[PDB]
């Protein structure tokens, strides 16, 4: 199990600034079409859910990329998750 | 339950000088992008509401930071809330 | 039949300041996700409609909570509805 | 039909000193949040338009209140409207 | 074919002050809900497009009303369209 | 033959503000589940088509209810249909 | 008989925020494919119905998991069901 | 068209002693708040511009009042404008 | 209801020497930033209005402070208000 | 209407020895700060105008005080005004 | 083979401002219902894909119309495609 | 291409006294509402940008009017632009 | 890879004066509708993001145009990016 | 971290003579448009905040320039900040 | 708290010979521009208020300098303040 | 770069007799409205700053005119600037 | 069958303002002599009856004209008739 | 059933200020003799009872009049009754 | 219907100073003989009644003249009538 | 078909100021001899008829010239014709 898959629900619920993470991911991991498609969702939890629906293909490296993106944007949330573990 | 979550509605309604609290929070707790995004709202209640929409990620420590910021700016409001409790 | 269900259409049409009622309801009755989801709608009638789509689960107590929220925000509208009854 | 609804466009276009009418209305008819929200608009016609968007809830009594506020501030405009009728 | 349907694209592109036309139309032709819904769009072309999406129901009389509203607000644009014809 | 069945295609094509009619119908004629199900359609013509697929059960009284709802929302369209008759 | 099987119809009808419950269930009880498949349904009652069609395999433990998920999301609905019992 | 609206730009540019005209207008046509607000502008052209922004409400009678005020203060300017006509 | 909230409009309209009241309030009740911000307004009624927009946070004690400040500066106005009561 | 408000313009224009009236008013009606502030104006009409801008707060008693001050200083002007009445 | 069919994938991927092209096409080539249906899609690539799903009926003339619409909106993209050829 | 459209950016950047040009344009080309709306912008470049956003409707004649207004106010800037051409 | 695509995230985050770049781009590269649409976004990062969503169509030449626009407005940022490379 | 970013809040709060620093910065670091835009703010803290919103692009060299500007204008404030460090 | 901040209002009200204190402060504490700017105010209380608006930057040493300047110019006022303490 | 743009800050700071330069410039380079507007500023540095804000339009010839005006009024300052160069 | 012939009796009985319809019809459909002759009848039903006696000659176009005239004058009656149909 | 007849007992018991309601009703609904006769009762409940004994004749309009009178005098009681309903 | 014909009875009853209105009307609308004849009546209501008996001939223009005369003489009565409308 | 040829009869009948249009046309389109010859006619319709008899030679460009001349002289007539179209 990964970190992102462990607290999948937690990330979906409590991640707020999703646009920044997407922009961090865009190009390196997220195709333009996938990026816009996930961006097209209305609510932030919905955006996260679509992101996670698009995470199936990703290898361990890409999950690491997303983790890097999240650690940068929301260090506190990441701390909360590690504490929960 | 926290103090900020307890009187969420009260803070949203009756907090006025929001820019100062944001500047207090900026850097320590609020990213530049989140700070500007919350600042971009027109009305003060709207600014507070966006701030609270951005508060999901925050850990207990960050809620404490915000409490410190509010106690400094509006001691009287804080007193009113404690009395209500 | 309730009061909110009686004049469902009337509330949807003629309620304007919906954000305040939501903030009153948030936490006590409305989950963060449901609150944001209903807030994500563009027009006020649309926001009300989503709110009413989310009202199915609510017990009599929660309908009472919403009634309290509306009576506080729009006493005049509430008076109009009672007169119609 | 009311007087305010009859010449809705006329009031939106030709009412200038809107702040005074709002202050007259504030408390009695306009909540603090609604008052600030309508005040937050840039142009006077925009302020009027927001005011009219917030007028849906108002009962006949509140429309009368607004009429009183306008008759006091702009007697001449009121005369023009009656003549048009 | 009408005038509004003839230069549908032209009106969508080159009409700027749309709020005034809406206020002219509101009540007589546009319901409060339709009026707000069309107003809820961000860009002026988008507002026009929504207006035209709402124009399907309108009879010849209502298209005439809209034409009157546009001729008043933008006489020059109307002249350009007639010249194009 | 009814009025709604006569110009079934016309109503499906040229009715735009469908949400309002549904809200008018909801409770009195449309069950919550049927209401949401018809609302779940993407395009307005699709919403109308689903509404008409759900109209089979309706008695003359319910068709009258729908007619009332449409006459209120789109008087002009109703006029066009009567003229066509 | 279980609680979920007792008020199967009630849960199908009156559960609204289904996405959250699914996210709570995903991983622990719901496979990714089953989760997406149930999510692919249009209406919330349809989503619930598919969820219940997928509940056949579940052991008592998994029904308990779902109950936990529902009690968290919709405490009021759960109360209504117990009262009905 | 009026005289004041005809040479609106001319009056804005070439009227100098604006305070006297305001004092002539104050009470009869200009509310205390409007009077001070127009007086609060720095430059004379700015004062005139604000005055003209406040002239929308005025009826023909009030435009006549302003004309009287200007004819008294600046007979020469009035002569220049009539000659231009 | 307070005294300041009772005659909110009256204070906004008829208070003139606002700078002195602010200086009386500065430090004890008004932060430096709030003080300057309210001072930055052009007209005295505007200054009062901003002051009242900043009065939301204030507790009963602070409203009393403002009352003290006003009673000192404008005893006559205070008398007029009490008589009105 | 008062006497001072009736011939406001007349007093502003034709009162010359303003310092004496101020000294008569100082203490009883005019605060030291208001007195100096009105005195700080350059021209006599400007001094009068500032005095009248400061007259909003004054009760009937204070307007009477000012009238007494003017009757003493300029009996002839007072006679002219009564004749005009 | 046509130009639009040649670079079907390219147009679907890299066309951005799709609304304008639709408005250009609406009436001449696209029925109101087809226009709205293609507009109802969320993402721009999805809108293009629906447009291409609706392009089966179109004759060479209509494909030419679409080409004209695209050449006007995105000359650069058209250049890229010709270069690829 | 016009002159105003040619050096659109140049006019936006280097035009300073915008109020005068607006007053020149007001009535003949700019509606009262459009005039105030463009005036409501804070910075001069912003005012110009709004003016240019409102220039879409204008016919060649109105662009000529604006050119006349600019040539009068800023002959030097006009010379610079012609030299650039 | 281009320069703009390389530091896409960096440009989105750290570009501030976006209006000027747009005005530089408008006409040559950005259509009026695209220009207004990107301008309609609230925050500067959002404006940049929309700009980048609209950059898909652009050929190498247009990316060069944007680079020119950015180098002119923010030479320092451009230097930072080259150093990062 | 820089010095300006360290005490961002402190500089925003306690810097007073901002115009001089801007004039020092104008040309070398601040574009004319950015300079005017930051100058357009009402209050000094607001001016500083806008300045800091415009500081994102700036390289280390430009932050040094601003530091030089501040050290010259307010040596004492700079001393206070170093002591705090 | 300092002495100057303690009796801020008292100093603003009752300090008269302000020019001398400024000249004492000029060079050592007050920049030429700040000195002239504070001198540019009309009334002495206004001059003091501007001085205090410029006192934010000052360190304890500079507040001491101002205290020295005041003790020299108005020993009696200083005595009154100490007695009040 | 020009001479006036080179030492923009120096001219703003150290130019004192600004009225004379304006009178020299008035008519030839400065419109009456611009002249009064720049004159309306309180402090000399502020007057210079407004003058420089109005200098954007000026061609090389007008900058030369201003240079002539300054060389005549303040030869010594001009010498200091050349030495600095 | 036509609409006027269908509800001939209904129109004869329940049409009241007949003069207006005649004036609408006069010239286009009704000769001067026929118009006066139908007008010469005493009672409104008699006028209608004579009108219908004069309707024999009328073609479908003229019956349409009369329908237009009636729809304009008595929309409600027209609605009643359509409902009866 | 009416509102007054529904809570007849409640109104009889809990209405206190009866004289005011009578004065409101006198003339419009209550004859002088009936008014005095109901007033002649000793206790307030007795007065109400006599009022209700005199309410038999009243039409729906008069019951509405009484409701208006009560809503004005005792809004709180009216709220209690609606809640009971 | 006109305004004078609407409240014919009201004008007859509540108009008092009738001679002034007649003098205003005499010459323009009222012949010398008609003027004296209406003046010959004893009571003011009788004078009004005769005036109204003489109003049959008057065209819309003359009814407007009378309205002007009444609005000037009795603005309050005119206000009462408009409110009644 | 052209515009002038479409409403040939309308222009002949309803154009009044023909001399001005001729003067506009003279030189550019109308030879001196043709101009005088058309001018030699007595009545305005006759002048128009001769003008139209002389219009046979004119190319599309010259018909455009005449249209320009007419639009300038009689904008209202041109509007009437477009409406007729």
Residue numbers in the entry:
A (entry chain L), B (entry chain K), C (entry chain M), D (entry chain I), E (entry chain O), F (entry chain P), ...: 1379 to 1463
Paper text:
NLRP1 and CARD8, two related inflammasome sensors, are highly expressed in a number of cell types and play important roles in both host defense and human diseases. In general, inflammasomes leverage supramolecular filamentous structures to nucleate the polymerization of caspase-1, which in turn increases the local concentration of its caspase domain to facilitate dimerization and activation. Here, we determined the cryo-electron microscopy (cryo-EM) structures of NLRP1-CT and CARD8-CT filaments and analysed their assembly and specificity.
The total diameter of the NLRP1CARD filament is approximately 140 Å, with an inner hole of ~10 Å. The NLRP1CARD dimer is mediated by reciprocal interactions at helices α5 and α6, burying a substantial ~300 Å2 surface area per partner, and involving residues with large side chains such as Y1445, M1457, W1460, and E1461. Different from the CARD8CARD filament, the type I interface in the NLRP1CARD filament is more extensive, with type I, II and III interfaces burying ~300, 430, and 140 Å2 surface area per partner, respectively.
